[PDB]
Each structure stands twice: as structure tokens, then as C-alpha cells.
Amino acid sequence: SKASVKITPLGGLGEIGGNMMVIETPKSAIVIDAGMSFPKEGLFGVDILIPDFSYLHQIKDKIAGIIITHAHEDHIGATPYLFKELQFPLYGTPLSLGLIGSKFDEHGLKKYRSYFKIVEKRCPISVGEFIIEWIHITHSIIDSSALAIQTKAGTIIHTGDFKIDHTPVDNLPTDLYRLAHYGEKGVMLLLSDSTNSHKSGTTPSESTIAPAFDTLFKEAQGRVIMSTFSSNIHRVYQAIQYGIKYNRKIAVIGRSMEKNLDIARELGYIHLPYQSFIEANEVAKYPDNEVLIVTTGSQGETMSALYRMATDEHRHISIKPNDLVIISAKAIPGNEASVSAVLNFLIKKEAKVAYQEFDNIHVSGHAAQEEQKLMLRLIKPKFFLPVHGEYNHVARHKQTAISCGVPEKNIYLMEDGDQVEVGPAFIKKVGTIKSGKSYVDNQSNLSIDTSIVQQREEVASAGVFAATIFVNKNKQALLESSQFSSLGLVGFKDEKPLIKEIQGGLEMLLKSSNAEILNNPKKLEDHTRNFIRKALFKKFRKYPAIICHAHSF
Amino acid sequence: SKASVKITPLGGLGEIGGNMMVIETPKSAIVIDAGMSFPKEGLFGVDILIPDFSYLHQIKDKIAGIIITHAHEDHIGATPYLFKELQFPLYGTPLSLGLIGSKFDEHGLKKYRSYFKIVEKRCPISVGEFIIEWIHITHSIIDSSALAIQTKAGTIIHTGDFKIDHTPVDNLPTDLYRLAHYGEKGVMLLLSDSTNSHKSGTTPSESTIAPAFDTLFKEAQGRVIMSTFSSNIHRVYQAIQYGIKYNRKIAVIGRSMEKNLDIARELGYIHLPYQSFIEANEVAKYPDNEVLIVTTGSQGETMSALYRMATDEHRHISIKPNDLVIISAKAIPGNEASVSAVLNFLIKKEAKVAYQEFDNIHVSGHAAQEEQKLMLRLIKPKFFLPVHGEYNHVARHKQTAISCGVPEKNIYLMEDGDQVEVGPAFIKKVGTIKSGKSYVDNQSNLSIDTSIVQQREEVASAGVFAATIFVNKNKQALLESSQFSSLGLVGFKDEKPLIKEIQGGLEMLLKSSNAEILNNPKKLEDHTRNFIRKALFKKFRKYPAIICHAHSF
């Protein structure tokens, strides 16, 4: 009857990152964004997670394209890999589409590059039975945008990643007029950031950071090091601008930085004298006070480089006591241990460290309660649904919305995989769809089901002991010396006896075993598993994986 | 010539917890404290670490006893297990000695219980060539103390764990006069807390917490849950006092809580009507608003209970939407992930949660910069050496000491295992001693070298594939069907072929193998390892552990 849509999301509900939405209307289908989720972060790298793709293959014939709301790795990460399975027009932003093409070429998905479809800011883009608009909106990232969707069913808003910086370094303030206009006409659906719903007071503008660089650089007497990730372009821009202001040549380490710099500079978003850029191998040729280094590893890796620098195998840079190191890695909770370790190792090198001002403690990069309320009033929407956060954060954001006078019955909290049917004046849950994650190794760059590592680590608890006994079916006992191996059981020097005790018990059982059980590998494997379970219960209270091999040679 | 001592520490320098010092003088030796170090904390439990004991066995004939500065698990943890190797008089505090005896009986070390030697507060205790005094000093813990050591070489101060609470619930203010008196006579050596050297402003007094319980309990309409660890006696005391003030029966879950309660109540430190205490199984008989539950697991375990309560197998408590849950686990960095997970699962149960006021964010329990400076002025010591913290924290504390006018040349930063010779007016490093950690399983309660799990997890990276081939020395090939097993390699349904491809290559090599290499297991194992290395390099760029077994049946 009345026009309606079916918006069921694939990522973002249950973890920072890995955001991906799929709006499904009658004979209509659009994709909003495809990020990566980073649960942990260690001394050598990060956890690599890409959203499952099973649902996409179900309704392939309907999806009218991919809609990307960032030139940033956290939100386009699966786009390149996704094309190793399916292809769809990529209607995005010129800068956002570029970096995405770099990702795909790295993923070997040039097919999907032809799908590139530049959407103009403040300019609508007719996507099948839908109209799309990219509303500039301030954020850390050099470029960004939000989506306004017009449909015969109404209008839908996806902001997602936005902090309302009154004075951004790029002084390109959000074009609030359009958002207010959409509110004035009447906005059906709203998707808004919910990350920092636990904090109060508006987040500080990046310009609050400028003084930090200025003061630190005036007092710096030696080399300056900077550590971040491949997609914090604004921060590195500020850093290099100050360095040239302080006559420090820039050394860019990590090919991701180099490609981002070249793409942006060619795109003209910034101005940079190429001669001012240097290699790490040339640092020894320059004075310390003229040396500013930029460091990043693979996609998502920042402090693997730092740790190897503290371990001194970087073979391009030697940490010195007169150095000043500025640390800003992706401040996702649970990485404090790695930061502390590297910090201690650096102080052992007698290096001054600056980390207070760039992590989430000062600048989280996502709206606080006041900013969310300001957006909510700007919109005056009928239906509010939080995305890009955990269940608690969306709960708090919904509470804040209640404080703004939004009727409860138009607010829902999603769980990944869910479907929600939304109409002109109706909204309800209809079912769940299968959502999941997949690992990718930064070296191989292939998708691996989580099942393999899951079982690997599940059996990692408790030991793994395998044995092979060459027994004669006519003797019901081992005829040739059995070979045994163990991993995680006990120290070899101290395990030689213990495992060997269970060994004698087992080979005795053979001396008078059951011929049928001995001749049938299944019975031997079951008996070995039972014996291993009993031994592990006696020793450590576990039941380790036991591999048994029977031969009739 | 001049009197001097040799203080080389065994634990505390490099991690929160696991503090243990050994002062070594001519024909003199004393032990200060033996804690446990907790690097991580998960959904099912904690990491279990006990300091190495190798050095103790070297100078056994000199040590005059064990000196314990807490009735608290974080500082006496290795004492019970240590006695499974060596025995020494335990001169401690009556309450501190009790709990320690409980730990030893759990460890089956009753031998060391006879060594129990009660030291009187404000009363000196002659320990061989040394004089010892237990100076009450405020802290979270119901009881505590610091050590004043008089010697012919001078005086040594160990405070260690102390926050200067002006108004503690127990209103037993630190007896500063003695500390000032020792400063007045002239204090040689000072060992002081250094945990929170990164923070400014004095830590809030536990009394700041009272209002929280009062207000929350006035508004509570349902059951109240409380989650902590076995040794936060003061907090549970406040909680139960308020609950009786609000007519809530107390259910103590975790035998550690029950034993601590019985020991303290028998010791008369507190007053408690036994009839007011209840079991969890009886909660269903009482109204929700009369129900307050206390939860703790094994030593160091707090949220394993919480997680099973969210998973609903606690089979004594069912979480309800009207419940109010107060969470205070040992807030060591890196547990935020578990807290977040449990919090989301609880909100899925629609439960109100209170966690802001009890973690390290409000009350870290260890002195801040102002408190350290106040101690430093109270002492006016000649030699300052920070303990109970990481290298960065001790560095910051030493900086603060510099700000207090302490000459640098009397401040050192230790690394675990080091020896430092300290005289009347001399101090220097002399060498290093072997320091290390050992795991203990909370179920078995035995000491395990870290080597076993270290190799277990080192080989956990990459797969583990073993094979056994029954070959004839006269054929240089397998004569009986070879048996293969793999763990972590690939999914069985998808690994059957791949592993089987490498299998055919290998059994072909047999068809025309080297008889001597085939007959000699070493050559077969080397060839199998090389083949596995090549295959893993081709597939995932790894070199997995390969186990080869050769038979001549």
C-alpha cells in the first residue's frame, strides 16, 4: 500500500568500525559504506575483520550501486575485497572514489573501478528509484560527507561520521542550510553517529591542537618523530605545515602515506613542495632539528614500526635521547598495554614523548551529547535509529534523543543482521539475517573464515599429542616401534618420561589389546582419546586433542 | 669498612603487582613481601603469575625471615606457594598473617604456618641484625602498614601501598609522628609507591564513595548486585553496612569472601549479625528490594561470575530488568574489552549498571603527585628509590622528587633482578640477578614454567601437521598406508584435498625415495620439515611445526 523500505544492517552494530548498511525497498536496493572492525591492537599489528557478504549474493539483481561516505580506510575497507565476489556501480565522492580505487588495485579488483561514479557535493544524484546528495560535513578527515536520500516513501539521512568543528583547519564549515531544509520539508529516517554518547561537552576542534604543534616545535632541539595511521590526513597536513614553518624536512615512511600524499596533492586538496620531502635513509645527512619523520605500517598498523624502532631493526632510523616523539595511533580501547610497553622502551632510550593531546581522551573525533542534540534539533526527524557504535552507546544516544522530545515509538536499537521495515508512519522488526566477520592476513590479503582460527585457538587450550603405532591385526599389539609427538604438553626434557609413562601403559594395553579394536582405526582412535582425556583430567583437568594413526604394514 | 647493604629486588619493577624485595646485608638477609602480577583480565579469569624463586635458594642460610606489608592478596600471593620450596619465619601483622595462613593451607604449606611471627604496630621487632616497625598507614585495605628498618648502617623505609586518606571509613589516621621522627633522626633508604605518578591532584578519599551507595540504595527498587575481588574488604564493608541500613540481606558468593568475612569478624575488626547473611539459593525467597548479592570467583576472578550470569548458567541467580548492578573489578589496563562485553550483555537484559565511581578513574587507590611530594617532605630522606610500578611511573616519580630538592645522585630506577649496593653515603649498581615469572592454573594450583605455554603459543602460530609412513628399508617407499593428522591447517572438508595433494607428492617421493634417508628417521623428518616449510611459504608464508614418524614394521 503505502511506500516503505526495508533497512537491515550488515556492520557497525556491536563494535567500533566495520560499518555497512543495506537499504532494501521494492525492486530497489542501495549499499551504504563498507568499513573494517578493529577489536584489538598489538605490538606487531591489528586484528583484521571484514563484514560477511552472504546476503549481498541473495538479492544481487536489485542493488543499484555502492554509496561511500568517506575517503577513509575505516569505512571503505571491504569495498575492494567485496568486488572479488560481486560488482556494482560505485557512486561516491571524487577523493573518496580515488583512495577506494587504490584499495581495489591493491586487492586486484580493477573490474569494480569502472563502476566509479562521482557524486557532486550539494548536487543530487538519481540512483534508480532514489535521489542521493553528498552534504559536506566537518570531521577529522580532509573530505567527508553525509547522505540525503529522497524517495517516494520520504527522506532518509545518514551522517555517520561527523564532529561539528566550528573552525576546522580546512575552514570549509558544514553546509547546515541543506540539513535544515530537509528537516523543514520533513525527514523520515535518520542515521547518526553514536560513538561518544557517554561523554558530555562538545569535542574540542582540531584547531585546539595547533598550539600543541607550535609550542612543541619551537622548543624541539632534535629530531621529531610522528606515528599515526594511513588515513589521518589532516593531522599529517598540520604536522608538515608546521615542520616547513619550522624548516623541518618531511620523511614519509609507509607506502600508504606516499600514495595518499600523491593522490591528494595531484587532486589539489593541499599544496606541497615535493623537494621538501625526504627518505629515512637520508636522515643521517641532515641536522636533527631539520628532521621530522612520518611513520605508518600496513593498513591499520602504526606501532609495529615503533616497536621495531625500540628494538632497533628499522635499519633506517636510530632513536636518540634528544628526539621528540608524537604518538597518535587509533585509540580503540584495549591498546593501552602496547602503548605502555613502547613508552617504557622509549624512556629506556631517554626519549621525550607526547601522547596526551591526540588520542580519544582529548579528541575522539565523534560527536558528544551536545553535538548529537544539536543535530537532532536541526533535523526534527520522525524516525531516529543510531548506528556506528555498541549497544550501550546507541542506548545512551536514544536516551539523549528522548530528552529532545522524540517519541520513543520512533526510535529503535539495532543488532547486526536485523531487518527493520520502515514506512511513512510505521516501523517494526521483521527478522534477522546472517551477519559475520572474516579474517584477512596483511601479507596474503585473502579472506579466511573465522572458523579455522577459532578451532585453532580452541584446541590451543590444552596440549596436542599425536601417536602412530604399527600393529599387526593378528597380534592385537604394536609390531613396530610407535612414534609420538606432542606440542604444548610439557617440556621435552621433562616430558620425555611423563609422556613415556603413558606410552608404556598404552603399548602394554597393545600387548593384550582387542584385535578387532586394534585393526579398526576408529576403535584405536576412540581408546586413545579416552586415555588422553583421563590423563589430562588427572594432570591439568583438561581434554586435549588426540590424533591416533593405525597401520597394518 | 662502613656499614652497607645490598638491596636487589625480585618483583614489582615492570608491572603492576608481583612486588617482592630482598634486602641483603653482611651475614644479614630479609624478605619484603611477595605479590602476584596480573598482566591481563578476561571473561573467564585472569593471568596467574608468581615471581621466580631461584635466588632465594642461593643464600638460604642468611635470610632471617619474611616481612609482609599487607593483609591483601596482591602482596602475599607467592608466600604460600614459596613454602613448597623453602621455609622462613613469617614476621607479619596479626590480620596480615591470618589471611596468609589461609593462603598457605590452600597451598598445602602448613609447615610455614609455625613461622608465623606477629609484629606489633608502633612496636619495634628485632630481626637478627635489624629492627623492624609496622607504621599504620591509610589505604583502601582494612589493615595495612609500612616498614621502618633500623640498622647500624642507617634506616630504611618501605611504604609501598599507601593513599593518605584524611578521613578513612575506619577513621584510624596514619600515625605520621613516627615517620616524621624517623625523618628527624635521619633516614637512609626510602621505598615508596609510584603507581599513579602520571596523575595530578590527590586521589579522592573512600568517603567520597559513601554518597554513591546512599543515593543509589535509596532509589533502588529491585535486587542489588555487587561484583569485586576477594580482597576489597573495605568496599564490601561499606556495602553491607548500607544494605543493613537499607534492610538488604547480604548473599556472599565465593568461598574467599566467606573466609575473609569469618576471619575478620572473629578478629573483631568489624561487627556483623550472622543472621543478616544469606545464600544465593535463598534469594528467590526474599523480595527484590531486600536482596543484595556479593560476587567473586577464585583468587583474582571477578567477572567470570558476571559473564556466566549474562549467559544464565549461574543456576543460583537470574538477572532481572529491575536489578541494579555495581561493578568494581581490579581496574588494570587492558580489561576494558571484557567490561564492555559484559556491559552490553547486561543491557540486553535491561539492567541498570553503575561503574563510574569504583574503578581507577575515580579511586586508583595509590598516591598521586601531591601525596608523593607530601611523603617526600615528611621524610627528608638521603636515598630515594621508587618501587611498585613500571619504568615510566618510576621515572615520573623521580622527576617529582627532583622538584622536591632531592639531589639526583641519590635516586635510582631499578630493573627487576638488579642488585644495588647502598652505604651511608654511597650507592651504585653491581650486577643483575635472574628474575622470571611462572604460571599457576587456578584449578590445579601448581607452578608451571612459562616455557611450556611459551612454546605452545609460539607453535600455535602456523598449523601443526604430523604424518606417519610405514616404509620398507628395501623399497625406499611407504609399504603401508600413511596416516596424517593436522590441527590449524585448514578446514577438514576443504583440507581433505589440499593436505592430500601434498600427500601424493610425498608418497611419490617415497615411490623413488632414498633408501638410507627413508630407513633413517632423521632424514625423513628433515625432508618432511623442508616440504612443510615450502608448502607453508607457498600458502600462508609460514613455517609450521612438522612431526614425522618412520617405521620399519
From Swiss-Prot, chains A, B:
Impact upon substituting residue 373 to A: Altered cell morphology and significant cell lysis and cellular debris
Effect of residue 516 to A: Significantly decreased homooligomerization
Chain positions recorded as substrate binding sites: 362-366
Gene inactivation effect: Essential, it cannot be disrupted. Depletion experiments show only slightly retarded growth with an increase in levels of at least 1 mRNA (ureI). RhpA remains associated with the ribosomes and polysomes.
Effect after changing residue 259 to A: Coccoid cell morphology without any cells in a typical helical form. Significant cell lysis and cellular debris
Result after altering residue 511 to Q: Acetylated mimic with no positive charge. Has a significant increase in homotetramerization over homodimerization compared to wild-type. Decreased exoribonuclease activity
Major enzyme class: hydrolase
Regulation: Catalytic activity is regulated by the balance between homodimers and homotetramers, with homotetramers being the active forms of this enzyme. Acetylation allosterically regulates the homooligomerization state and hence the catalytic activity.
Gene Ontology MF, one: RNA binding
Residues that hold Zn(2+) 1 according to the record: 70, 72, 139, 161
Free-text remark on how the cofactor is bound: Binds up to 2 Zn(2+) ions per subunit. It is not clear if Zn(2+) or Mg(2+) is physiologically important.
Residues the entry annotates as binding Zn(2+) 2: 74-75, 161, 388
GO BP, one annotated term: protein homotetramerization
Phenotype for residue 457 to A: No effect on homooligomerization
Cofactors that this protein relies on: Zn(2+)
Main location: cytoplasm
Effect of residue 185 to A: No effect on cell morphology
Role description: An RNase that has 5'-3' exoribonuclease and endoribonuclease activity. Degrades 5'-monophosphorylated ssRNA and dsRNA, considerably more active on ssRNA. Association with RhpA significantly increases the dsRNase activity. Degrades RNA substrate with hairpin structures at both ends with low activity, but presence of RhpA significantly increases the activity on this substrate. Stimulates ATPase activity of RNA helicase RhpA. Involved in stabilization of mRNA but apparently not rRNA.
Name of this chain's protein: Ribonuclease J
Gene: rnj
Entire-sequence positions represented here: 139 to 691 of 691
